[PDB]
Design a protein around this ligand. Structure first.
Ligand SMILES: CCCCCCC/C=C/CCCCCC(=O)OC[C@@H](O)CO
Ligand SMILES: CCCCCCC/C=C/CCCCCC(=O)OC[C@@H](O)CO
Ligand SMILES: CCCCCCC/C=C\CCCCCC(=O)OC[C@@H](O)CO
Ligand SMILES: CCCCCCC/C=C\CCCCCC(=O)OC[C@@H](O)CO
Ligand SMILES: CCCCCCC/C=C\CCCCCC(=O)OC[C@@H](O)CO
Ligand SMILES: CCCCCCC/C=C\CCCCCC(=O)OC[C@@H](O)CO
Lengths: 181, 182, 181, 181, 182, 181
């Protein structure tokens, strides 16, 4: 069976990068972030999680499907007011929501200790990303959100690296991109 | 085949904490509760429930798919009035609705006895969570609703703890977080 | 493979009680019944029906997928007018619609004659539930609708007992809740 | 594997019966017909067709999926104007559309000659149903549509019969309802 | 495993006839063309295309899923303006769009040579169908559009004939309708 | 199992030509490109990607499912404003979005170094296609967008040749259209 991990890391990677260009301040929360969170960071990563089921990878099923659902919850929070369904979110409830996802990311980082180090760097930077976004929203500190953006850019780039690191290593049967096995 | 239980416990646990942060009085019924109740506590738990089928886990198939269906139904209750389809729910009807989920949770708690004791603590606290949410809403007693909020914060936290207990114990091949594994 | 019957009986059983809590006159036809009819009584029972396909259960594939579709059709009957698509449903038409579900349920009840005594009670009371609801809708009889609610409350409560009977008995490997297997 | 044919015949059966109570004149084109054509006569019969794939039944895959899609096309024709998307259909284009489905039903009736006669009666009455509906719409003859309704009631009833005939015969392992094998 | 080709040929054939009854001048672009292009000519052919995967039929997987995708795209072209999303399509753009489908149909016709000669007649007439629909719409020549309508009525009829030829030949175990089976 | 690559290359190849017929300046960004981006270039390529999972093709599972998601994200970028959900996409943001798809395409191009010479041309021209579209969107260069269209017309036309090359060659069992296998 094929390896679905690079698809989810690519889905997580490009979607994490784009969101944090806004968090860093390059742009505003554009629909380019919203479209990628629905299909790539969302459904395409949901597909990567469900495909780890027949692979016996409990971590992959848990990681990709959870974060894939996270992007679907993120877009839903931002678009339901534009549909008149809800109110715009409370930033402290957004901080705790971003904080709970940091707790999930934290324990999952310990699950990467016996794994490739490029995946450990992804889950460590994602822990820093979720932790900085949580305190930045609760405290109302826009500077920390700017900091979390640059961490998210590093987080999303390294996720794309491992995605393309796994593919290029399987296509040629040798280490084309070293991932820290 | 992979173990889907951490996916259903994380979706149930994370969403339960956020909803009961509102019942405890910290925040109002914000859109984050509704978003988590659709995709993580809802659809992601449906997946985790459906993935118990080929695993031969009738309990996990029943529980995760039902609680995933619970979160989906609870969201449609709170959003259909804003869609102009229905009206705001009769609060006492919501008590029997949650009370039926308490009856389901109570019976399912008896099914956890020969499982991990963390799972027994999840289904027992969830039974107490659904119960105080039913009574406090039927009688309109905001105090027990606040007390129900604190019980759920423990119930959701123990479900996340059990999910991550199951993840680390397989990633390390040794009991990293003791889940009372029978 | 796991047993999908407790999942379908629970979704059907809970939505039956909640529906007939309105048929008994306690509450109006709430959005709680509509939401429970879509996902738990409907789609969750659609899933439980399809799971019976690889189980070799023609009856379970036919029953759960039909009653799961019933809750989906019933919700569409009551919600399409609110969208400007449909008029209010005709009371005599809705009774024939309930009668056809009672006719289908009647034949399926005889299919349970060689199964657990608890499953026989579920299909027996559901046939009387559909019949009283069909008769009460065609005739416009408030009292028959009230009696149907009490029939449905017990029918949905017994379906929960059978579902939880099939859950606990497999957990402990013996009869914890007797179901007349 | 389970037998998905009774689910489709039940999905086709109840949906064919209800539509032709309007075609016969008992009621108007209510949403009860529209809801059943979306989920039962549509999706639930689509499920019956896709499940005949692993059964090697080319006829079952072709029959249930085609007529399941037919109900989805029927509801789409009737509801797209109510959504402002299209114009109300031209009855001659509806007659040819109903006529083309009769041609499909005609050749599929010859495919039932070496099969159970209860299925032959279904596809023969469905051929009469589609043929009467086609000429009735093209000619503008409301009387023939009244005739096609009563044929559709017989067609939908016999389809439910075979659906419950196959289930009750498999549950007991003997002929409970004779279908003309 | 079942033979899904009659499902894709019936959905393609039935929908092709109805659309080209309009191109021949009998009727206007009515909602029946749009309904058939979604569920039968579209989704039902996607299913028939997806069901060729485990059958090892790269041709049937490619053709049915693409032509099912064609009918879905053609409907979204004609309905998005009514939805207020887009504007009415540039007629000459629709000619290159159909011309690309003619290029796809032409190459796929060469793949039918070692198949049933009825299938060769389907893909050859379909190539002529897409071609005259492209030219007559690029130049705005309503006459060849009408001539394209008559070609499609034959192309759709031969696809239905081949579908029912495949059904009866398996139901009877003997060639009931000769499809030029190689 | 069948080969899903011709289905995905056709959907990507046709939608590439149609998109770049607007990038070349011949037509405006039509609804024909949006519809072809949803179903053929998008979902049909999503199907073709998932089919590669049981084929053991990590590259094909990653490529088709990503570019199929790309056409789905691109259509959502251009249609969400028309629904009142989103502002118009930023030209510099859209260029970075195109650049990330070019970065992903660049690494995947090296994955084709041990495959057919026709697949190498597809990923080579698509990388230049994304780069010119990314550069032309960030800089706002009408001429670079025009050159990108001609790059895309040939890229989509060659993808059709490779797809039809993989179709005909399996039909006849020999090389009918040379692809550099
Ligand atoms: C949309 C269908 C595409 C089929 C492509 C994959 C091949 C599987 C063929 C079986 C299709 C049956 C539809 C649902 C199904 O999987 O049945 C099995 C499951 O429902 C029983 O537990
Ligand atoms: C919604 C998922 C529920 C799963 C229940 C049926 C058990 C199948 C487990 C595999 C899930 C992977 C998701 C898609 C899939 O079937 O992969 C196989 C296919 O895509 C490769 O051709
Ligand atoms: C991505 C999601 C962003 C917006 C979230 C909206 C959630 C409300 C429900 C959507 C409305 C709807 O069409 O109903 C879908 C439901 O019927 C599926 O069964
Ligand atoms: C546009 C208005 C309709 C919004 C949803 C678009 C889907 C196509 C129209 C289908 C209408 C039938 C939906 C319905 O009756 O309720 C069932 C659904 O809400 C629960 O599954
Ligand atoms: C049952 C269908 C009755 C009404 C038919 C409406 C068809 C128009 C398309 C539906 C609108 C929509 O929500 O888009 C769905 C499409 O995006 C699925 O990919
Ligand atoms: C309510 C307005 C939206 C109608 C559709 C309801 C689904 C939930 C909102 C998702 C919006 C994203 C849709 C979009 O951007 O286009 C993609 C889609 O049309 C093609 O697959």
């Amino acid at each position: 069976l094929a390896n679905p991990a690079p698809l989810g890391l690519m889905g997580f990677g490009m979607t994490t990068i784009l969101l944090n260009l806004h968090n860093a301040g390059f742009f505003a929360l554009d629909g380019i972030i919203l479209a990628m969170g629905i299909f790539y960071g969302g459904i395409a990563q949901i597909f990567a999680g469900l495909l780890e089921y027949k692979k016996g990878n409990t971590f992959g099923l848990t990681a990709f499907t959870s974060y894939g659902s996270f992007w679907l919850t993120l877009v839903a929070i931002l678009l339901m007011p534009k549909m008149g369904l809800t109110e715009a979110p409370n930033a402290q409830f957004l901080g705790a929501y971003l904080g709970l996802w940091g707790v999930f990311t934290l324990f999952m980082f310990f699950g990467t200790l016996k794994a490739a180090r490029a995946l450990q760097f992804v889950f460590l930077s994602l822990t820093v990303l979720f932790a900085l976004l949580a305190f930045g929203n609760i405290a109302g500190n826009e500077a920390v959100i700017h900091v979390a953006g640059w961490i998210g850019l590093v987080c999303g780039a390294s996720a794309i690296y491992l995605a393309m690191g796994e593919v290029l290593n399987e296509q040629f049967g040798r280490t084309i991109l070293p991932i820290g096995e």
